[PDB]
Amino acid sequence: MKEKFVLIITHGDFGKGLLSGAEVIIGKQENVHTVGLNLGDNIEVVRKEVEKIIKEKLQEDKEIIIVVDLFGGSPFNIALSMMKEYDVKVITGINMPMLVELLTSINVYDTTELLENISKIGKDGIKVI
Amino acid sequence: MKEKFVLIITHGDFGKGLLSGAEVIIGKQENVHTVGLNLGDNIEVVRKEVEKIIKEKLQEDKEIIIVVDLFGGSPFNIALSMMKEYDVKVITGINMPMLVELLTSINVYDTTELLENISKIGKDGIKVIEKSSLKMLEHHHHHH
């Protein structure tokens, strides 16, 4: 199995903070990068930066998973454009249980099963007490 | 309706960044506070701080919703302990679609319906995107 690389693309500091939070739980990550879309960012500039990252990682023979905050919106639109061009895989609605499970099982499952796993865990992790 | 106050408790800077992120989308919000738990944090101290915030907001006649990152660990432990003593509601597994819906509709629904609403929106907002679905998503940009 190819080594995986996780790109987190979200609004503002969400991805940065989500990774920070996960790292409190499971320690400092390699092979995870965050890109945040802030008010005042040009989406085409951000798109080109994301593409830069993907090419670089593909050239390192890595398999790429893009995790997005929200279905719809500029981060999602960027992720979709990368799937159109580079055949990376994409999942939306990322939360903490998903990211922790993803990063601790990244070597265990193939990308398709990995994403199905965390989709299920993410939904199950949302509970009104 | 009483005004609502949302307290987000998570590991590290997750809650802080989640709120930052949501405000890019829906603009600056009021009545939302974040508490992050880091390694080596004295958690009984954090619990005490949270209780103080809750007491204060209750004195301001606010209805309190606590949102946590994870069903597990210290943030949920703290949230549970508040629920045992105070009239607060708790929801776990917070994500962007949930928080955006929560804050945008905070004065439209009572807490019970509100948490039910955002639970469904949060789960529905978690989607694996199939490559084969790309073209169909693109069509939606040209019709309603």
Interacting residues of A121 by C-beta distance below 8 A, sequence separation 6+: A97, A98, A101
Candidates 3.40.50.510, 1.20.1250.20, 1.10.287.110, 3.40.630.30; CATH matching A1-129: 3.40.50.510
Class of domain B1-144: alpha beta
Q: What is the distance in angstroms between the Cα of A6 and the nearest Cα belonging to chain B?
A: 15
Across the interface, which of B83, B95, B131 has its CB nearest the CB of A83?
B131
3-state helix, strand, coil in chain B (%, to 5): 50, 20, 30
- CB B21 to CB A69 under 8 A? yes
- Residue B66: how many CB atoms within 10 A of its CB? 26
User: Which residues of chain B lie closer than 8 angstroms to A129, CB-CB?
Assistant: 79-80, 83, 89-92
Mutate to test the interface with B, among A9, A37, A95, A124 (most CBs of B within 10 A): A95
DSSP state of B133: G
Read off the DSSP letter of residue A2. Answer: P
Whole-number Å distance between alpha carbons of A24 and B70: 13
Segments making up each domain of chain B, as ranges: 1-144
| Residue that has been written with the tokens 């790429």 in this structure | A64
Residue B86's Cα: distance from chain center in Å? 18
* Backbone torsions φ then ψ of A91, nearest 5 degrees: -135, 145
Q: CA–CA separation, A62 vs A25, rounded Å?
A: 25
DSSP secondary structure letters along B53-70: HHHHHHHTT-EEEEEES-
Residues of A in contact with B21 (CB under 8 A): 10-15, 17, 36, 69
